[PDB]
Structure formats: C-alpha cells, structure tokens
Amino acid sequence: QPAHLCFRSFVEALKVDNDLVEINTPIDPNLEAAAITRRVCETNDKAPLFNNLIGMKNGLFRILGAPGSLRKSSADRYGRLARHLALPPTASMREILDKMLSASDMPPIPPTIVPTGPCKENSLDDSEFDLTELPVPLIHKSDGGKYIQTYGMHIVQSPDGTWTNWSIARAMVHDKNHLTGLVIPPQHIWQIHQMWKKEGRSDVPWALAFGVPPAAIMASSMPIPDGVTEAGYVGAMTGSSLELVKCDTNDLYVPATSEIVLEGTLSISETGPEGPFGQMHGYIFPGDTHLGAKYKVNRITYRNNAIMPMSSCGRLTDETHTMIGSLAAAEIRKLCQQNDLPITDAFAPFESQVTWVALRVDTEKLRAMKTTSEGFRKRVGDVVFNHKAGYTIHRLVLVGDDIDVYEGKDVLWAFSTRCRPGMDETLFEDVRGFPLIPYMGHGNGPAHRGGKVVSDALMPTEYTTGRNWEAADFNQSYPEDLKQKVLDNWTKMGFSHHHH
Amino acid sequence: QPAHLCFRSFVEALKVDNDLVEINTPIDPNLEAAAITRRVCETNDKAPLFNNLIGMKNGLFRILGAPGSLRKSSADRYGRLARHLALPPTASMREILDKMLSASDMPPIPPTIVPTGPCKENSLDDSEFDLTELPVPLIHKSDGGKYIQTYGMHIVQSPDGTWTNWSIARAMVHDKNHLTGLVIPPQHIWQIHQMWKKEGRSDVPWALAFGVPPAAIMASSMPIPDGVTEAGYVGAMTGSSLELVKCDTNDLYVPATSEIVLEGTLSISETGPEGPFGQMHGYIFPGDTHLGAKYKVNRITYRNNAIMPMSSCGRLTDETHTMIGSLAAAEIRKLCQQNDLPITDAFAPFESQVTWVALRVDTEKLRAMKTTSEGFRKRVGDVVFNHKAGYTIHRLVLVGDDIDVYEGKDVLWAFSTRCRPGMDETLFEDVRGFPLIPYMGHGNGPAHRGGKVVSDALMPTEYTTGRNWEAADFNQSYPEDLKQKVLDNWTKMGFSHHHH
Ligand SMILES: Cc1cc2c3c(c1C)C(C)(C)C[C@@H]([C@@H](F)Cc1ccccc1)N3c1c(nc(O)[nH]c1=O)N2C[C@H](O)[C@H](O)[C@H](O)COP(=O)(O)O
Ligand SMILES: Cc1cc2c3c(c1C)C(C)(C)C[C@@H]([C@@H](F)Cc1ccccc1)N3c1c(nc(O)[nH]c1=O)N2C[C@H](O)[C@H](O)[C@H](O)COP(=O)(O)O
Ligand SMILES: [K+]
Ligand SMILES: [K+]
Ligand SMILES: [K+]
Ligand SMILES: [K+]
Ligand SMILES: [Mn+2]
Ligand SMILES: [Mn+2]
C-alpha cells in the first residue's frame, strides 16, 4: 500500500527518509512519551516511534509521536506533510495547500467497500477491553485526563445518510468504556450531533479510527465545506477510491488499514468532565474542567502490532500549527477567491500561534476595483469572519504582492511597517470568536464573540497607482550586476549548503 | 588607548575577535561598499574594513561597515556592542542596557581638555577640500545623495553654553562645502537649533566627528534627558573623563582620537534638498526629497589613514535596530520606573522593526496596585508616548513575568495569545507620531500625530490573584526529574554546542 494510503506504510516511509527514531526500550505513557515528543516538536527532530510502551498488552499499542511536525532542514521542512500526500519531500507549502485544495473542483470519488482489512486482525468486545487499562498517554502534567485521541479521525453521519464527516477532535478516557471530548460549534461533528439531537430518537452511531490513511487525516483536519463527505474529497485528491470496511457493531465504514478502531455511540444526552488540555496556543489552565460530550465504546478492532499516532501539542511547532493553521488558511484562500476577492495566497504564520492569517493581494486587480482600505477591509472580514473557515483566526493581515505570506519574517515586517494601529484596522465584535485562545475564553470579554480584526498592511498607492517604494535590502537596493559580483567574490574576500 | 575610548583601538579589537574582514583590493564607494555591508548585516557576518576605497586621496578615507551589527553566534551575538563599552563579548542585552543606564544616577564626569590629539594629524582648509571629491558612499541605489554621515556624532551647544549635545543624525553631501540632513523635533539637535533660531543672531557653531570613542557613539544614539551633556554621562559610565581637543575654527570640543572632524555651522536660515534615504524600517521612497537642514563645512581635520564608519541601514539587522531600538527601550524602562510603574525590563523586538517595545511587568507589584487593564494601559501610554524616549515607538506590549522581553519569539507568543484585539488595547491619537514609519509619513493619516497603541498582554488574573496557567511546553508541562532524564538519554535514544 502507498504511504499516503496506509499509515503502516507511512511509518516505513519516515524510516526510509531517516526521519524516524525507534525507541525499543520501555517508555512510560505517563508523561515520558509525550515529553520526548514535545522536545522533538520544539527542535524539529525526527519523529519518535515508541515500540515498547509500559502498559502495552495484547497488541495495544505502540505510539508514533509528531506525525505532522517539522523537519530541521529548510529544503524538506514540510516533508512529513508531503509524505501524507504522495508529494516529493521538498514540496513547498504552496504545493501542499494546492494539493489539499485540488479536490474542490473535482467530482468526488466515493469510497469502495471491501469485506475485510488489517483493522480486523484483532478484536475486543465489550467484556474484554477496559480503556483505563490501555497505555493511554498523559500528554501534559496538568491535563484533566489521558488523551487517547489526538490524531485519530471521528466518523459520524447525518441522520439521512447523505453526509459522512471525518474530523479530528480531542477526546480523553472517562472510564472503562467511555470517552469525553470536545464537540463545539461550528465544527461538523457538532453540526451532525445537533441533527441527531433534534431527531431525538437515538445516540449518534460513531467510530473513531486511529492510524488512518495519511491523506485522510489531512482532510480530517481541513474545514472543507458543509455537507461534503471527506472520503470522496480524499478520493478525488488522491485519484483513487479509498477502501473501507464496515464496522462490526454499526453500519459506519472505516479505512481498511486503520491501526485501531473504536466503535460505539456519541450521546445525545450525557456529558462528562473534559479537559483541561494543553493545546494549540501553548497553554493549560490547570483545573479548568468543563462538561464535554460523552462517547460510549462498544468494540475495539485493531491491527497486529497496532500503532497509535499522538500529537504532543502546545508551543511551536506541532500538528496543531502545521495542519490546523495551514489547512484553514488554504480554505480561506479559496473562500476569498470564490467571493471575487483578489487573494492569491494565504497562510497562518507560526509566529502568531496560528491566530493570524496573512492574505496576499493581487494589487493589479485591487487597483481595478477602485476601492479604499476601509471598504476592502470590511468586505474581506465579512467574508472570512462570517464563515466556518475563519473560525480559528482572529487577525487577518492584508499584504501586497511583494510579500511571501509563507515567510513569517516578511509578514511581520509588512504588518509592523505598513499597518497604522487603529486607523488601518477594522474590529469585528459581532462575529463568532474562538474560545480556546487565552484572551478569549480566559480573557476580559465574551468567550464566544468578537475579538477579531482586519489589519490592512497595503500601502495607500497599492489601491491607486502602484507600489511607490523599494526595500532597503540587498535584493532591492542594488543592481543585479553588482549583487552578483558581491556574491561571486564573497568567500574570496573572506566572508562565510541548500540541503545542510 | 582602550577600545571603548578610541575608535582605532576598537577596529583592532574587532580584528583580534576574528570579527573583521579587511578588504585591501579596490572597492567602489558607489554602492559596492554598502552592498557588501548590507549583506553582512542581513547575515550577521564579520564587519568589513575597506582599506582601498576608489576615490581615497590624501588619507580620506577608509570605511568600516556594520560597526554595531550582530554576530552570528548566540553566545556573542551582541559582542560588537559589548566592545563599545569594555564589556565581555558574551554580555547580555540586559547587561549592555544596564551599562548604558548606569550613569543616570551618577554625578557627571566632565571632559578634560588636552592640547592636541590624533584628529589633528592632518587638516584641509576651506580652499583645499571638496566634499564632492571625497569617496563618500552611495548607500542605496535610490538615495537622494551620498550619505557621508551615518555613524558620526554631531556636536552642538546651547547659546548659553550650559548644554553640549552629542547625537547621531543623518546627513548627505549638498555641494563642495555643505551638507544637508535631518534635524527634526523632538531631537536634541533640533531643540538646540530652535534656541539659536529664536536668538536670531547667528548660525549654530557645529562640529561632526566621525570615528569617535565607541562609548560616546553609543550615548550619541541614546535619548538621555534634555539638558544633559553626553560627554559627562559617558565619563560617568566609563569611569573616566573623556579627552577632548578644541576645534580650530570654533570653540567646540571634539574627541582627541576622532578619525575625521568637520567644523562649521548649522544654518538658522537655509535649507536644501535632503533624502530620500534607505532607513531603519526597511524602505526607500525614490524621489521623496524634502527640504532639510543645511550645514556649512569650513575645515576638515583627520587622522593619518582615517577610517569612516558607515551604517548600511535598512532591513534587519543593523545599527538602526541594535542601537536605536535597544537604547530607546532602555530609557523607556527607566522612565517607567521613575514614574512608579512596575516595569522590570524593556526591549524593542527586532521582529517589529523596532517599532514596538515590550515592557515586562513585576506582577506582584501590579497586584498590589489593585488596578485594571484599561487604567494601567492608559497610565503607561501617557507616560511613554508623551515623552521623547517614546518618540520612535508606536506599540507598547505589556507582558508578565514569565516573558523574556529580549526574546522576540516569546514576545510574539504573548502578544498573539494574551492581548484581545481592540478590547485589550488603547489607541493614542493625540501624541507625537514618528513620521519615518511608512504607515505614518506615507500612510493614510497625519504624518506627525497619533497612530500609537498600548497592547495589554497581561492576563486577567495577573492583576488580581496571580498567573493561572502553565505553558504547554517542555519546560513547564513536565516535572524536573523527567525533563532531566529525557535530556540525559537524548543522544542515547537517537536524537540530535553553546559556542558553535
Ligand atoms: C490536527 C488537529 C486538529 C484538531 C485538533 C487536534 C489536532 C492535532 C488536537 C491535538 C486533538 C487538539 C484539538 C484542538 F486543536 C482544538 C481545536 C478546536 C477547534 C478548532 C480548532 C482547534 N483538536 C480539535 C480540533 N477541532 C475540534 O473541533 N476539536 C479539537 O479538539 N482540531 C481541528 C479540526 O480537525 C479542524 O477544525 C477540522 O476542520 C474539523 O473538521 P470539520 O471541518 O469536518 O468539522
Ligand atoms: C544609530 C543611529 C541613530 C540615528 C540615525 C542613524 C543611526 C545609525 C542613521 C543611520 C544615520 C539613520 C537615521 C535614522 F535612524 C533616523 C531616525 C530619526 C529620528 C529618530 C530615530 C531615527 N539616524 C538619525 C537619528 N536621529 C535623528 O534625529 N535623525 C537621524 O537621521 N538616529 C537616532 C538618534 O541618534 C537618537 O534618537 C538619539 O537619541 C538622538 O540623540 P539626542 O537624544 O541627544 O537627541
Ligand atoms: K474535515
Ligand atoms: K495600511
Ligand atoms: K544622545
Ligand atoms: K490581556
Ligand atoms: Mn467536514
Ligand atoms: Mn541629548
């Protein structure tokens, strides 16, 4: 099976890439696995594969940390992500995001049902497993539970059967046969839950699949449109129909090569304590537990020698930055274009803790609109902040064509020098806010509303006659022939490789 | 002479430090010297000493570029600056700024007059020099003149004789015997100029000394208080009285070891074209010339084998960041403390193009004030933005004790996650603005007023009961004994020096 279609093959690919460290001595799931992974993420090291996890029994489970985190070199910085998608390991962010967007104007390729797969190699019924006895990690010392679910895919379907959603949402062990987790608006798992709660007749049939096809977990982390079944979008993106097997205890379908599958229900009535969790902005508020959604597990199926992927998330850089931010930015780029806005590129700078998105403007097109900053900021912010794709993002930074939005240094330069505080900004208080940001849910104002801004880092002539400056930098302040002479004599004179 | 007291000795020190590249083949002052220096500054390379400058005659002149720029290693990042001050080359920013502030509660040590010095080795009267014939650099391709003055010290004295100011302000060659330059409020050269213009009787006696004692050029770049003679402040800082010689054509006094001295007058009546200049925010606006102040040169004196220091300024990182921003931040720290504000540290993040200052708050003291964000932001911003030390700074970011304001990554983290846009900010429109920032002088609003903000990145409990989070990072989310085990087994397991 190809790496992008089979998690087990993806793990091989990381090895082959010299991007894996296999740890075969005993490692404790209580903090140690996550501490090693945290260190990896903070230093862009190789992904850790914990083959000897204290508490692993009967095949459950090994852990792969940092599956979507960064590599140290510039040349293959995003290689782990490229390996989710069959792209060369040197792919740029633009190329990765374009791949993730490509299925948006293709016909879906619906999945293919097969009779069995590796995820059926082992099973545990409802008298044989106990989720408190598995080697579930404690990821951060102050977490409110052991977070089994940081990189699996929840599968729920609308009551009418017409939409099956795949998404990542956190969940922790509640007791031997239940989880609690986040299920919050406007997320699709919440939207589908609401449909079942209005029908009122039953709990939501559910599955949670860990170690799914890498291309599937990327779509699971992306805000593709309402009503769009991720499996068909991934099929179109990859050019292949995904192979799914039916659950044993319900009629949902899971990837055939899933490492571990939980089958059960998401309650339409019950809740239980959930959180706190150290997360994507870099914080944990010890003791802030809240009621979350409650899942009942009826069955586990799993591969021989199953591997659980884990995100040890928090401060830079991990999956909560590389995937959540970048994939939201991709969708925002498309949304803006579909609303006739002259946006060429979008990215969530890591330096902003993926709370900003920088939008690169085609300023030739802007000039033809014959508009002003106030009007344009309002239009952009109305489009983005009124849409689910904009949910996580609290500051949009508009930049002209000279800025590479994938380079945070350049975004910061433009923001700091081209956007006058106050005058060049529009605040949005009557939009949905993202409560997870500390200044929202632990801040001075409403946790769920407002706190958003469009910051215009377009200069005045960019709306009228064109850019009227040159940068005071080596690139722009010296002629080509001089630059090349400098470069060619650099080591000669006495001063100081692309791969490294 | 010690390095901090004599520029010629400072140049030796850089060599000795393996922090100099001597270029002994011909280099063109038309762009080439500045392009090499620009490249140095963008890559934190060794400082260039151009010993064979095309157009050098009769000893005028060699060029040293990048005198106050950064070194590549973390361990001696600020070593060039430390070498201006007799500090170890590993000194921290806190230590450098503390040294620069130390004279603020010491008695001045006034300078000592000596009969001669190296700056008198050669002279050119007013029939022997022509400033258009010297190898003055063109620093950026679009500059409006050849900027002779990027790292010398202007010397002007109040009409009553009681205040002699030393400061850096740019100036370019106008004709054979005149310069034009910036002389703008609230700068001390402007304040003294105004005193002479109100008296109305004569032009301002002036000298411009290049290659002055390094400790003197640091004070020249710092906003020490109105009325304070820099020479006595430097004397106190260094513990020694500076040796000065009298000018030949006026009664001002210049450092004895100055490399090059211009003597003449700053007009109280005349102006001439000045600029544009590629500068500290990273821009040049080709063609934006304005009238500037006009200087007449009557005499040149200089050392044998004189060296002119040059700042090839623009995008990160050069003297306009390391010195202007850091030294302003130092003064702001002191100002805040003298106004009873609980500020421990201040720094202008390079990532903000030195347009922000981050202020670290002693939150124990804040808690005892029993105040609120709105009130505290207003108080801080009134103090800073109403003072000359705050002139260049358009955003103040308040952070708690966990943030190291000298680390831009941490400032950006705090700003992005702890300050709710709008609600947690106070805009200041009725304060002096810094017109050099593009969004000011080339922006949508008044060039000289407003555009300032205090952004409060203190969390709510920091005002009341104390920090209520822990970071989701390796440092804070794992116990000490576990962290140390991870570190001690890191290379063992398979993962990857302080000087490198
Ligand atoms: C890659 C990734 C994604 C998420 C999450 C995680 C990772 C590693 C973690 C490690 C489990 C952390 C959390 C976390 F990142 C939480 C969060 C909540 C809302 C929006 C964005 C982020 N998690 C997650 C969460 N979303 C929650 O609702 N709920 C969640 O708990 N997302 C983001 C989510 O997968 C995307 O927003 C996706 O678009 C959802 O799919 P949908 O468009 O089909 O609803
Ligand atoms: C280190 C340094 C400092 C400056 C300047 C430069 C350097 C390398 C350059 C390369 C010549 C560029 C320019 C430039 F940075 C301009 C500027 C203008 C106002 C405030 C801050 C910065 N320059 C300069 C300028 N000031 C102008 O007015 N006028 C100036 O032209 N400063 C900053 C200045 O030295 C400090 O603001 C200092 O506090 C002034 O001394 P004072 O407090 O005694 O008035
Ligand atoms: K999704
Ligand atoms: K703007
Ligand atoms: K000064
Ligand atoms: K705040
Ligand atoms: Mn969806
Ligand atoms: Mn002064």
3-state secondary structure B377-445: HHHHHHHHHCCHHHCCCCEEEEECCCCCCCCHHHHHHHHHHHCCCCCCEEEECCCECCCCCHHHHCCCC
Name B426's bridge partners: B454
Q: Which amino acid is at B222?
A: M
Resolution of the deposited coordinates, in angstroms?
1.1
Chain B, nearest residue to A409 by Cα: B351
Which of ligand 2's atoms lies nearest the C-alpha of B323? 1
A390 is written with which tokens? 């904009």
What's the Cα-to-Cα distance from B175 to each of B53, B79, B130, B300, B306, rounded to whole Å?
21, 38, 8, 15, 22
> Residue A136: what residue type?
V
Q: How far lies A390's CA from each of A340, A346, A360, in Å?
A: 17, 12, 16
- How many of the other CB atoms lie within 10 Å of CB of B22? 16
Residue A234 three-state SS:
helix
Q: Are A167 and A151 in contact (CB under 8 A)?
A: no
| CB–CB contact B417 A439 (8 Å) | yes
> Do residue B471 and residue A395 have CB atoms under 8 angstroms apart?
no
Q: Are B453 and B425 in contact (CB under 8 A)?
A: yes
Residue type, A349: P
| Residue A416 identity (one-letter amino acid) | S
DSSP 8-state symbol, B44? T
Structural contact between residues A428 and A450, judged by C-beta atoms closer than 8 angstroms = yes
Report how far apart, in Å, the C-alpha atoms of A104 and of each of A88, A195, A221 are: 22, 25, 15
**DSSP run (H or E) holding A40:** helix A32-43
The minimal CB distance from B373 to the residues A140, A395, A444 is found for A444
**Structural biology method used:** X-ray
CA distances to A156, A157, A213 from A160, rounded to whole Å, are 12, 8, 26
Q: Taking CB atoms and an 8 Å limit, are B283 and A460 in contact across chains?
A: no
Residue A113 · residue A246 · CB < 8 Å = yes
Collapsed DSSP state (helix, strand, coil) of residue A466:
coil
User: CA–CA separation, A63 vs A33, rounded Å?
Assistant: 8
Does the beta-carbon distance from A353 to B413 stay under 8 Å?
A: yes
Question: Cβ B315–A471 below 8 Å, yes or no?
Answer: yes
Ligand nearest to C-alpha B216: 5
| SS3 at position B467 | coil
**Which of B277, B449, B456, B473 to mutate to test binding with chain A, by most A CBs within 10 Å of its CB?**
B473
> Which residues are in the CB-under-5-Å shell of ion ligand 4?
A 419, 424, 456
Q: What is the DSSP string of B142-202?
A: T-SS---BSS-EEEEE-TTSS-EEEE---EEEEETTEEEE---TTSHHHHHHHHHHHH-SS
CA distance B63 to B51: 7
Whether the CB-CB separation of A391 and A434 falls below 8 Å is answered with: yes
Reference B474, options A308, A260, A282; nearest CA is A282
Cα end-to-end span (Å), chain A:
31
Alpha-carbon distance of B140 to B37, in angstroms, equals: 11
Chain A partners of B286 at a C-beta cutoff of 8 Å? Answer: 468-470
- Numbers of helices and strands, H then E, in chain A: 14, 22
* 8-state DSSP, A436: T
Nearest to A445 among B412, B423, B451 (CB): B423
E strands, A386-431, where?
Answer: 395-399, 425-428
- Kindly state if the Cβ of A397 falls inside 6 Å of ligand 1: no
Residue in B142, B162, B132, B165 with CA at minimum distance from that of residue B34: B142
- Contact of B169 with B180, CB cutoff 8 Å: no
Strand pairing category for A356-361 and A395-399: parallel
Q: Which residue in chain B is spatially nearest to A46 when comparing CA positions?
A: B495
Q: A203 CA to chain B: closest CA distance, Å?
A: 34
Distance CA A229, CA A162 (A): 8
Q: How far apart are CA B165 and CA B167, in angstroms?
A: 6
Among residues A348, A89, A90, A324, the alpha carbon closest in space to that of A218 is found at: A324
CB under 8 Å, gap of 24 or more: what pairs does A388-392 form? Answer: A388/A186, A388/A223, A388/A226, A389/A223, A389/A328, A389/A331, A389/A332, A389/A335, A390/A328, A390/A332, A390/A335, A391/A186, A391/A223, A391/A328, A391/A432, A391/A434, A392/A324, A392/A325, A392/A328, A392/A354, A392/A355, A392/A434
CA–CA separation, B153 and B39 (whole Å): 25
Please spell the DSSP secondary structure of B66-131, one letter per residue: -TT---SSSTTTTHHHHHTTT--TT--HHHHHHHHHGGGGS-----EE-S--GGGSEEE-TTT--G
Nearest-by-Cβ selection for A314 from B412, B472, B479? B472
Residue B338 is inside which H or E element, if any?
A: helix B324-338
How many other CB atoms are found less than 10 A from the CB of residue A424?
24
Q: Whose CA is closest to B452, among B385, B497, B387?
A: B385
Q: Is the CB of B318 under 6 A from ligand 2?
A: no
Paired sense of beta strands A178-181 and A290-302, if any: antiparallel
Count, residues in chain A: 500
β-sheet bridge partners, residue B419: none
Structure tokens at B198: 């109100």
As a whole number of Å, the end-to-end CA separation of chain B is 31
Residues B180 and B147: their CA atoms lie apart, in Å, by: 9
Asked whether the beta carbons of B395 and B452 are under 8 A apart, the reply is yes
Q: Which residue of B has its CA nearest to A394?
A: B421
Q: Which residue has the tokens 């606006």?
A: B285
d(CA A370, CA A375): 10
Residue B486: both structure tokens together:
């991870």
Distances (CA, A) of A353 to A118, A147, A279: 38, 22, 11
B174 Cβ contact partners less than 8 Å away, ≥ 6 residues apart: B145, B180, B272, B273, B294
Q: Does B69 sit in the ligand 2 pocket, CB within 6 Å?
A: no
Radius of gyration of chain A (CA): 24
Sequence-ordered list of residues with C-beta below 8 angstroms from that of B353, at least 6 positions apart, any chain: A413, A416, A417, B280, B281, B282, B316, B321
3-class DSSP assignment, residue B212 = coil
Token pair, residue A263, equals: 């089958």
CB atoms within 10 A of CB A287: 10
Q: Which residues contact B15 (CB under 8 A, 6 or more apart)?
A: B22
Are A440 and A431 in contact by the 8 Å Cβ rule? The answer is no
Per the CB < 8 A criterion, the answer to whether A383 and A426 are in contact is: no
Identify the three-state secondary structure at position B53.
Answer: strand
φ, ψ for residue A20, nearest 5 deg: -130, 145
Cβ–Cβ below 8 Å for A315 and B45: no
Residue B208: both structure tokens together: 């411009």
Query: Which residues, in sequence order, are CB contacts of B257 under 8 Å at separation 6+?
Result: B1, B5, B6, B7, B8, B117, B118, B119, B211, B212, B213, B243, B303
Q: How far is CA B364 from CA B227, B330, B405, B454, B459, in A?
A: 35, 22, 18, 21, 13
Which residue in the set B315, B427, B493 is minimally distant from A23, CB to CB? B493
Tell me: cis bond preceding B88? Omega within 30 of 0 counts.
no
Q: How many Cβ atoms from other residues are within 10 Å of residue A358's Cβ? A: 29
CB contact under 8 A, B477 and A140: yes
Residue A27 DSSP code: B
Burial bucket for residue A75 (CB in 10 Å: 0-12, 13-18, 19+): exposed
d(CA A417, CA A397): 12
Give the three-state DSSP class for A138. strand
Q: Which residues does B366 contact at the CB level (< 8 Å), separation at least 6?
A: B342, B376, B458, B462, B463
Q: In angstroms, rounded to a whole number, what is the distance separating the alpha carbons of residues A33 and A27?
A: 6
| Nearest Cα residue to A450 out of A409, A395, A397 | A395
For tokens 């200087």, what's the residue?
A: B295
**Nearest by Cα to A67 from A402, A373, A312, A384:** A312
Residue type, A469: W
Which residue, B167, B205, B384, B213, is CA-closest to B295? B205
- Collect all residues with Cβ–Cβ distance below 8 Å to A214 and sequence separation of at least 6: A3, A4, A5, A7, A10, A67, A83, A84, A85
Q: Are B123 and B301 in contact (CB under 8 A)?
A: yes
Token representation of residue A260:
């571990």
Is B392 touching ligand 2 by the criterion CB < 6 Å? Answer: yes
Distance (Å, rounded) from C-alpha A257 to C-alpha B77?
Answer: 51
SS3 B260: strand
- Cα distances (angstroms) measured from residue B100 to each of A161, B103, B174, B322: 71, 7, 34, 13
Q: Identify whether the C-beta of residue A400 lies closer than 8 Å to the C-beta of residue A361.
A: yes
DSSP lists the bridge partners of residue B180 as B172, B294
Name residue B303's amino acid: R
Closest ligand 2 atom number to CA of residue B150: 11
Query: Cβ distance B156 to B189 under 8 Å?
Result: yes
- DSSP letter for each residue of A246-314: E-SSSS-EEETT-SEEEEEEEEEEEEEEE-----TTSEE-TT--EEEEEEEEEEEEE-TT-EEEE---S
CA angle A421, A425, A427 (to 5 degrees): 115
What lies within 8 Å, CB to CB, of A488 at 6+ separation is none
Q: Ramachandran region of residue A227, left (φ > 0), alpha (ψ -120 to 50) or beta?
A: left
- Assess whether the C-beta atom of B322 lies below 6 angstroms from ligand 2: no
The domain spans of chain B are 1-330, 331-459, 460-500
- Compute the CA torsion angle A252, A253, A254, A260 (nearest 10 deg): 40
Q: DSSP letter string over A140-198?
A: STT-SS---BSS-EEEEE-TTSS-EEEE---EEEEETTEEEE---TTSHHHHHHHHHHH
By three-state DSSP, how is residue B303 classified?
coil
In whole angstroms, give the CA distance from residue B170 to residue B312: 12
Alpha-carbon distance B18 to B79, whole Å? 11
B170: its two tokens:
């740019």
Question: In whole angstroms, how large is the CA radius of gyration of chain B?
Answer: 24
